[PDB]
Amino acid sequence: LDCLRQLVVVLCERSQLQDLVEFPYVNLHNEVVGIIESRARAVDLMTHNYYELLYAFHIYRHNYRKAGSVMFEYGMRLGREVRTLRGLQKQVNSYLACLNCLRLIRPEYAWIVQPVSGAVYERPGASPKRNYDGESSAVPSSSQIEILELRDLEKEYVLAQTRLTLAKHNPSTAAIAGSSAAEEMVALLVQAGLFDTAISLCQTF
């Protein structure tokens, strides 16, 4: 596992991404995915392409479901962390890539698994959140799991696309648009004068 961690790091630093995708990883596949996911979680979203690598890695092995899940996680993190015009454009592209992956799957299996919005992803290696009394707060033992269907991903895609259309029309709004709920986004589109996009958003939500 430590040699595998070293191999994945050195190949990513050398930009030898093809070899990393083509290797068979007999029984080590989940550990490689876990290492690249842990690094994709630790690194800045604008400087290194680890989500695009995880996506290429899953597409090459015909694992369209995990490929969709990774690109959806990428789109969600871009929406939270990178409130720039370029971040919103990458977010729309990652949700489109997710939708395309799920459309290649049979409709019966076309669902992604998410921990509910508010599940603290403890950064692996964050000091345990101590209460005021210095005790380790017991991990809330129910990461409620939300199952997202293709229709809910289409709503999130339309919401990201409407955020991008507003940010393209006024680049100063990109910071506000990135956090706006569907209701706030209708109010912002109406202020800009983008009524058809506001109507389309009202119909979808």
Partner 1 sequence: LTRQYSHHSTVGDAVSQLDSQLMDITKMFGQYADPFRLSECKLAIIHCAGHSDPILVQTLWQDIIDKELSDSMGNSSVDRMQSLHLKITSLGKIYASTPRYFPLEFLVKYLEQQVCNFSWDAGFVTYTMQEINVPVPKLLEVYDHLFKARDPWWSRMKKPLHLLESIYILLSGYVQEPSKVPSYERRRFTTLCLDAISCYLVELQSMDPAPALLNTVSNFKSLQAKLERLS
At 28, which amino acid appears?
Answer: L
The first and second tokens of residue 173, run together, are 């709004």
- Which residue lies nearer to partner 1 by CB, 43 or 182? 43
**Dihedral Cα 186, 187, 189, 191, nearest 10 deg:** 160
Least distance to partner 1, CB of residue 30, Å: 18
When asked if residue 15 is in the footprint of partner 1 (CB under 8 A), the reply is: no
When asked if residue 135 is in the footprint of partner 1 (CB under 8 A), the reply is: no
- Which residue lies nearer to partner 1 by CB, 117 or 127? 127
Sole binder of partner 1 in the list 24, 118, 125, 134 (CB under 8 A): 125
Q: How many residues bind partner 1 (CB under 8 A)?
A: 13
How big is the chain by its Cα radius of gyration, in Å?
19
- Which residue lies nearer to partner 1 by CB, 5 or 169? 5
> How far is it, in rounded angstroms, from Cα 189 to Cα 204?
15
Determine the interface stretch with partner 1 among 117-125, 139-147, 157-165, 185-193 (rule: CB under 8 A).
Answer: 117-125
> How far is it, in rounded angstroms, from Cα 122 to Cα 55?
23
Least distance to partner 1, CB of residue 45, Å: 12
When asked if residue 5 is in the footprint of partner 1 (CB under 8 A), the reply is: yes
Binding site for partner 1 (CB under 8 A): 2-3, 5-6, 9, 42-44, 123-127
